[PDB]
Amino acid sequence: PTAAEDLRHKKKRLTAMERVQLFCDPGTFRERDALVEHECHNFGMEKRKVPGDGFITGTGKVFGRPVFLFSHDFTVFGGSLSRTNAAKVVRIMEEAAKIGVPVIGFNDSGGARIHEGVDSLAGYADIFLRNTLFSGVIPQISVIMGPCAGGAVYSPAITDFTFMVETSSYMFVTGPEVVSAVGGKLVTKDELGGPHVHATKSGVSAGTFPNDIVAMAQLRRLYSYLPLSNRDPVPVLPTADERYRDVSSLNTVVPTEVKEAYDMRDVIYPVIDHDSFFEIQPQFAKNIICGFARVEGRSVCIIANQPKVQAGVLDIDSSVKGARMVRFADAFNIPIITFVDVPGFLPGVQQEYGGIIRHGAKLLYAYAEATVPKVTIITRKAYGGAYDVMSSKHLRGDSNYAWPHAEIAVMGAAGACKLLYSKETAEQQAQRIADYEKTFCTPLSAARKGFVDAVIDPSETRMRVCEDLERLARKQLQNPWKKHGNIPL
Amino acid sequence: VLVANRGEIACRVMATCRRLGIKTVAVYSTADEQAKHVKVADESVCIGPPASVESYLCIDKIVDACKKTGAQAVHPGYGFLSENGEFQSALQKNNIVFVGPDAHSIESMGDKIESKRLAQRAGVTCIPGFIGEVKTHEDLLRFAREIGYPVMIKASGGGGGKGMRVAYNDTQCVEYYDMCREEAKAAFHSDKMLVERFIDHPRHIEIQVIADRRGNTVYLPERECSIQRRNQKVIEEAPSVLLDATTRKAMGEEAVAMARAVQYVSAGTVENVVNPQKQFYFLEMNTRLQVEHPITEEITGVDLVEQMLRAAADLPLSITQDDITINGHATECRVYAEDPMKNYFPSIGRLTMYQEPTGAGVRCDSGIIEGSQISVYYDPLICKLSTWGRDRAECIGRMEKALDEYVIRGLRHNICLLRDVVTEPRYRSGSITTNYLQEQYPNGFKKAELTAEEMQLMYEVAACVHLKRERLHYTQGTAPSERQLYLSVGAGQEGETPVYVRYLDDSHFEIGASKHGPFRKMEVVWKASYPIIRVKDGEAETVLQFWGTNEVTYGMQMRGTTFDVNVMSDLQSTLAHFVPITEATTNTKQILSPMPGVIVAIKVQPGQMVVAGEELLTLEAMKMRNKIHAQADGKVKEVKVKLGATVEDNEVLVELE
Ligand SMILES: O=CCCCC[C@@H]1SC[C@@H]2NC(=O)N[C@@H]21
């Protein structure tokens, strides 16, 4: 019996129920509500009632841990929401708020249902309020499998992570017809809101998958990292890997020349456990890396610069990416580990015309507000305000480390030499820049002041990180009483 | 003593001293501050920039540096400027030991010419043939019949293989002489031809020699260097199959006789060419310390390093030809960073992501430790894998097994070629030739495929690994123990093979066709997220490797080759048919610079060949030199952006057409 799904598969596409079956465990899905009708009675809609009413909501179970989910249905009315569709979603989110369980939704709606009038707006508003209230209480993940247009786009935005499917998905606020009507330009749906556009240009989508099957397979892996609720502790899984594994290849990663580049992944991979990195937003703002990883069987958060791309310089997009990652990680009590290599901020008129001052402050706010244990490692250099922003010791950092060839200075040697000698005799470059770099572009001064705990061999990083992260397991820090902060938007 | 090399041999020397209780010193270049031989040494001194000239080749630095160690002797090594006069002269200026042969023998034998003179000095069965011009076809036929050889027609003034044709009969002799005279008159202005005993099919047998400054000269057992690519050898073996004492004893005696002839001290080695009729040809003799001796040392125990350093002090050896014997045979291979399947593309500048050497009853000499890199201006050799044995089958099987346990990550290599060559039944037949490689690899290189049972075993191991890694993620006792998987390699699911699994213990399963099917109870032992995977069904034993996965596709290595097996359940299998398979853009067009900057260095030339992975140029921006390369293409047609063109802004630096 394979009835009524032949029409769907013929278009090389899967069904909502099949997606739900693929996500959860083999036999642990219990559909909650299945016999519900729209009761519209307008515009010749009194007929063609549907039992499911276009939504599939259940409970399920992943890796032995509970979950909640819902999936849109494209065959029935195009997946449009109504006064009645939104009730099921509201009930699921409320139940997942009472119990410490997350929510995952597979969006496929074609837009609002016009035949209901303003009831669709009512349902949208209720879903928006539930998302707003419960953000930071239970993790929310959203996946977009098909078209997603109109005002329905906003609820995925408030969710913590949004993923996209490559061939047959798109998302935008207004359709290309209106764009043609007002501006006069003919742009296709994919050219407007395709997965690539949101992966590279707008920065909304947190990832892209080639197929639905791969999407489910990796969504399970992502779910294996998250904590169940706000009050539950960070999960710890058994692992045969051990902190005594030898990592001596880190002694040679940093080149002896100051103008040559290297890949920061060569430093990230040895420290964490084998094959346990899940990069977030891999194709957007490549000069910074963010993602999840495990250290001795417990999930941690990774944020590191990359001198491979644009000399590892902070920017607007990198600031937004890092700020969102830090805020989410702190909201759910996940340790943060950072690797620092920054020469400063990206210079340019477009930057000031785009508001670098606002955006660069977001990362600093996220780092200063955080109360989870932090570990910082300075590999090569840290200059100016970039050193302050990237989790400096003064921002209530727990432990800070440096490598023997690091440099921590106010600015580059040339600018310091220029400002320290206004009209000093010519040729001052040769006998002053070298001396200043020798005397003050070294971690000795910063260690004398007390800004780094110790200068360590690069081969001891795994040992030190495991020791510190084990000791810091029970830190309790609290901020002054506030209704909420006022972050620079 | 101080060494002069920076490869595996240097480590070997600083290792022989362990027993000899000899403190050692090792110099290095700037790039090699993290080489193993630096830390293995007792003392280290820098020799300037790592370019070859200043590095080690800078005699002045080296000889000058030889004034602080106190060492009364200094090894000459085997590479770089080893056994050199300009160097021997300098070391005898400061009156220090050379730990090597004497000058007169070295210049008398390593010289390109007059080697034939020493050869014919006592004849020593040197190249045979009519020594003179053949002015008539009658003379050519008569001298061909004299020895009935394949003629070996070669020009008197020609060299390098030009003007040579192989004649098997008299008519072939006449026709090939007619072609040879026409070729040589145009190419080398000489019509003078010579006829010599051509070899049916060569084996390039090599005979080892050792000696001493006092006496007790000994002949070491011979070796093999038949396999050769681009005049570089790959696989070696000391006791070749075509070994008769009638020849071999005379080979050793004649090698020793030639030794005292030029009063050679530190013998290099003797070269020969051998036909199925058991001849020998002493010429192309070597005067350098060949490092293929590990094989001989495995069949003898004759520590060449110890004996030569002992002879460097004017003492006789500790061994005589009377006790030298054979305890089996050994196989040795060389591991290159040369990517064979990709047109022998060189892969350099890649530190070892992570590597582990095979150490099961085998020997490995290498200078590349974990976290080490290979520059372009050096030898791309990785390791020198040699395994002891007594029987061909025994020694080979060992190599087979030892090849699969060599984990190399971070750069390519030629292990697949070595594996395929060893596994070939032609190689295990017993005899080979010097044209063996290109004879068995006509068009490029193509690795041999898998039989049905090997692919089935790979499927079974993949299913076991999938289940073992799956059980890790589950919490407490809420974990499964049995599934039914559908494995199919390839993007089109070629050969869907249903598989079961039961996981009766930690490292035991009950693999079968499906439910209610007979079970076999194999065994797999693998640490999560690690490379090596040991699996043993009954007696058979296999070792596979685990590269990575994306939870639907598994990257597993079988017989030194990468595959991507798909492990999916019933639902995933039945649904993967209804999935779009888009084709990525195949654009052969101009390449643009991603970001603004300055071009300071260029690598490729305008309108010539380009291959994948080749660096093209280097922009420098905000104090940082990048290096955009050529992802993949055959050639280009474009106009180069000149040096110092601070324009960029996503311009067309190179245009591919
Ligand atoms: O010396 C002149 C240019 C130096 C720029 C150095 C890098 S570029 C972006 C960042 N902003 C700075 O002031 N320094 C760094």
Short mmCIF file of N, CA and C and ligand atoms in Angstrom, two decimals, chain A residues 313 343-347 414, chain B residues 622-623, ligand 1:
data_model
loop_
_atom_site.label_atom_id
_atom_site.label_comp_id
_atom_site.label_asym_id
_atom_site.label_seq_id
_atom_site.Cartn_x
_atom_site.Cartn_y
_atom_site.Cartn_z
N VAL A 313 40.98 39.25 10.13
CA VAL A 313 40.61 40.59 10.58
C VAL A 313 39.13 40.60 10.93
N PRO A 343 44.98 41.07 13.75
CA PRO A 343 45.76 42.31 13.66
C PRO A 343 44.94 43.57 13.86
N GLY A 344 43.62 43.47 13.92
CA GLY A 344 42.79 44.65 14.14
C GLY A 344 41.48 44.52 13.38
N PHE A 345 40.91 45.68 13.07
CA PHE A 345 39.64 45.77 12.37
C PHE A 345 39.86 46.15 10.91
N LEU A 346 38.88 45.81 10.08
CA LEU A 346 39.03 46.01 8.64
C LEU A 346 38.84 47.48 8.31
N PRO A 347 39.84 48.11 7.68
CA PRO A 347 39.72 49.54 7.42
C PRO A 347 39.05 49.84 6.08
N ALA A 414 55.26 50.17 13.34
CA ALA A 414 55.43 51.38 12.53
C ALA A 414 54.67 52.56 13.13
N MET B 622 47.61 43.64 3.63
CA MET B 622 47.65 43.92 5.06
C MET B 622 48.67 43.02 5.73
N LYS B 623 49.88 42.97 5.17
CA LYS B 623 50.95 42.15 5.75
C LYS B 623 50.61 40.67 5.79
O1 LIG C 1 50.91 50.00 7.66
C1 LIG C 1 49.95 50.32 6.99
C2 LIG C 1 48.78 49.38 6.86
C3 LIG C 1 48.79 48.49 8.10
C4 LIG C 1 47.48 47.76 8.26
C5 LIG C 1 47.68 46.66 9.29
C6 LIG C 1 46.42 45.83 9.45
S1 LIG C 1 45.38 46.12 8.06
C7 LIG C 1 43.88 46.17 8.97
C8 LIG C 1 44.21 46.48 10.42
N1 LIG C 1 44.06 47.88 10.75
C9 LIG C 1 45.18 48.38 11.23
O2 LIG C 1 45.31 49.51 11.65
N2 LIG C 1 46.15 47.49 11.20
C10 LIG C 1 45.68 46.23 10.70
#
